[PDB]
Design a protein around this ligand. Structure first.
Ligand code: NI
Ligand code: NI
Ligand code: NI
Ligand code: NI
Lengths: 174, 169, 175, 174
């Protein structure tokens, strides 16, 4: 399970207030946890693939920032339009841009901290009804509610963090 | 002060000036709003218009969308971008009440990554474009850079003009 | 790059958390048992095998850890009782070439490391956050390092030289 | 007297092989003698000053560990550098650290046992010429040879052990 260290996100129809509130807290804490994992690494460690054939740690960090900026936008689209079709992006192509392969993680780590700050602030304003609003992914044709999207991105965060910490543990880094 | 004028060609020198201006935008916005009380933040810059607070959150939202559009344009062949309802976004409770500090900090880091991206681009990458399905126009990335410099200055001016007229300090 | 630096190098940080410090104190306390694990099973011929071509023997690495870490413990106490003291460099290559370093049984050094790490971690657990931010100065490299980063550095140093030994056993197919 | 129960160390110009060998044996035995001096002691006994203005028995134990670690390092500097300047430390300040005032003697007694084992091992490897190598205090600018340093640390050992045994005798303890 190199590609999926903590499995995949399982959607449900029934998500409690306590569960939503906990996921919001977990989401706010993601950037610190990511920073803890990555700040110990030198450039050659950052440029080490997390698995054979896969992205480097540096790429994963920049991907989290790009993915989560897209997600935040999708939340605001969903709150302001009725089940909007969202705009997919080619995450593989984004990760192959020169910047994604060479930029220091610090800027993306700082962006993520502030982004998850604003995102969790938005989430704390939402009513139960607003959490039941959704959006449509054009490629996969599936509709996801905002409460499930919150669960999904808690998963996505920790999925990628686990790629990094697993690599770090396997290589004997800190 | 004036609407942006699209150009067929933009010099390397002008691009570099605009990247630097874009890098400085968040510090200029912070200087314009950081001493403001809630009363001042929730004052409309004009009669039927958005408050200073709504403008700050809008810049963060607008510019995040723009950064995404840049990356779509660099990875797809003349992509159609995804418009958003900017008025509806500004009417969300969070837009009307959140403290500016978070959006100011986000804008700082966002412009940091955006200008980093811009400094990696070749001249030919700056000639890549995207299609805005509302205006029907193919906009090149070098012109979009110009547009977002104007966007920044236009909104910051609205804020500083309000403070000047009201005698705030 | 890999034979010499099997787990990379230590990267200092501007800030170290209470939780990280506590973990590192625990790891440092247990380091000697891990070293002993690796060296306990080895014959004299194995002890006198270089960890890489042109490198120290396993025996020398063990005695080096004891010498290095004694030096470090002293540097911590200097740092706590003086204001950013300049510490005393030592010639690690020359220390490892002493007859004693090339021939002494590892047992004494292993036992010394166990007790030293015991006293060192006891010291560390008494320290306030402010004391952990105190630093010392290396007169040759011109570097200033804080005690919390020196802690991270010596956890690394332990793992680094243990890896020298375990990587050797693996490459050699020993048991 | 009370401060100097066995007087002070008097350096000599030369030291016989016989004296050097006797001193190496004494040094090997010091940790056991120290252990015996504090063997039964309660915490209140350990926290008794050895004389009115003085360190507690506990502080004396931890001081011996610290002093002798510093001395061992000074031997190795002397063997590997040409008459090195050594690095003084503030004995009083080290002894005032919370750890020095409170830690159980056990760990320092065990450290001393292992340290003296490595130290006497080193000493048994030395040639006569290596024993004539020295080091200087940057302040006293006195050169001390390793054979005299051996005599000095034999003295130091029994000086501080006497502080303890004399205390026990003066009090009712032993
Ligand atoms: Ni992903
Ligand atoms: Ni605008
Ligand atoms: Ni080393
Ligand atoms: Ni003394």
């Amino acid at each position: 399970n190199l590609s999926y260290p903590i499995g995949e996100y399982k959607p449900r129809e029934s998500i409690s207030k306590e569960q939503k509130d906990k996921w919001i807290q977990v989401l706010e804490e993601v950037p610190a946890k990511l920073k803890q994992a990555v700040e110990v690494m030198t450039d050659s460690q950052l440029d080490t693939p997390y698995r054979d054939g896969g992205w480097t740690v540096r790429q994963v960090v920049h991907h989290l920032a790009d993915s989560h900026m897209n997600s935040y936008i999708r939340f605001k689209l969903s709150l302001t339009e009725e089940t909007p079709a969202i705009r997919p992006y080619d995450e593989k192509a984004w990760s192959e841009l020169k910047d994604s392969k060479t930029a220091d993680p610090s800027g993306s780590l700082a962006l993520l901290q502030e982004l998850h700050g604003r995102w969790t602030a938005l989430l704390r304003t939402l009513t139960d009804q607003q959490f039941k609003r959704g959006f449509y992914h054009p490629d996969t044709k599936e509709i996801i509610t905002l409460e499930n999207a919150l669960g999904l991105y808690v998963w996505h965060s920790h999925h990628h963090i686990a790629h990094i910490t697993e690599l770090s543990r396997r290589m004997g880094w800190s």
